[PDB]
């Protein structure tokens with residue numbers, strides 16, 4: 490009942506998916522064999538539990554990267570859709586010519602995984618935003634399945650370009666090309682930056698060797714805490730749609746932010762207690778979010794706080810009311826009590842409390858503005874355009890894409906100023 | 910009709926008996942509440958020890 494088909498894609502998608510299935514298997518008390526010791530797994534002969542996830546890419550090396558790692562033997566080999574040609578870090582390659590004439594097999598797999606369910610609820614994708622195969626195949630699959638299954642919902646945990654210094658040089662192009670496919674065909678899209686994760690892992694946990702494994706672990710923990718209020722009992726249970734309705738006021742302001750709590754170092758853990766005022770004090774902090782956009786530069790159109798464990802709901806409600814009435818400026822007004830709460834009844838594996846924070850803020854628009862600069866400064870000189878043109882891409886689309894992005898940021902700029 | 914038992918003659922007995930019963934129940938409830946509170950505190954201490962380990 491209310492199942493989830495987790496699709497991944499690209500390098501970031503595959504790695505985050507590996508760590509995410511590791512964390513999930515840890516939660517439900519499973520070992521890498523796949524035996525216990527419906528929302529995520531599927532039963533198989535002999536009491537085995539196989540994840541309901543398809544893994545796709547154009548480069549068969551990332552398979553041997555994820556498969557050989559621990560908690561790897563779970564994913565059924567009938568799902569590794571790995572084209573044996575290459576990706577190349579280019580959008581039109583993985584969306585029109587090369588990573589497009591393969592999508593039929595991916596649709597076949599998605600259909601065999603969907604029609605075999607009873608009441609499918611929503612798709613949950615994890616992918617990069619500028620990676621060629623990742624972003625390209627992600628947006629193409631989005632278009633296809635959303636034109637195909639409108640009854641269900643869509644959710645994408647994307648990773649934005651590292652704001653300060655980039656990781657690829659053609660990232661603005663593909664980021665804009667993906668954004669123009671998201672706001673037209675999605676229903677829930679959270680954004681994460683590889684930059685604020687560094688500042689967190691270095692100034693919140695006092696780490697010295699932060700490996701991409703640990704950052705992916707943090708992101709995956711956040712992703713699990715998001716939907717943990719669905720597969721578990723709770724004094725007030727939420728889902729993937731109660732958010733989709735209590736958050737987005739208009740069909741496009743659907744770009745959220747993610748925050749996990751609590752995250753503590755060694756000494757800082759020795760000195761602080763686990764009491765929900767402390768978790769709240771850590772939750773709203775700008776240095777505690779997975780999106781490199783200081784919310785202080787904006788407001789929150791809405792913010793849902795999904796707790797876990799066991800606590801008096803009066804404490805939660807008092808903390809919400811105090812943080813809302815006290816920071817009366819950082820919240821917009823024409824939506825009264827713009828903060829939503831929810832309480833599940835299962836703590837993490839080895840804590841007493843837990844908080845996931847999903848926030849539709851009007852502050853991330855700035856990030857988009859940043860991209861709206863770079864792309865614009867990479868188009869009047871037609872820089873790198875001929876590679877994308879070499880796959881039949883009509884430059885016209887690029888234009889409207891940027892235009893689309895304009896409206897998007899313009900939308901937010903119309904609301905953080907709105908008064909009533 | 911010279912006398913009507915509908916009047917309460919032994920009101921003092923009713924009052925004192927109700928007082929004693931109420932004190933008894935109050936004592937029982939106080940004890941069980943202190944027990945519950947101490948058990949909650951010890952469970953919190955257990956979580957403290959788990960986290961420290």
Ligand SMILES: Nc1nc2c(ncn2[C@@H]2O[C@H](COP(=O)(O)OP(=O)(O)O)[C@@H](O)[C@H]2O)c(=O)[nH]1
Pocket residue numbers: 498499500501502504505576577578617618619620621622623624648650651656657683701702704705
């Ligand atoms: N936190 C984290 N980010 C990753 C990881 N792998 C890739 N990324 C992001 O992936 C981006 C590059 O695009 P990518 O999807 O890897 O190229 P492609 O897979 O060949 O299409 C970079 O901005 C990286 O930040 C990972 O394992 N952990």
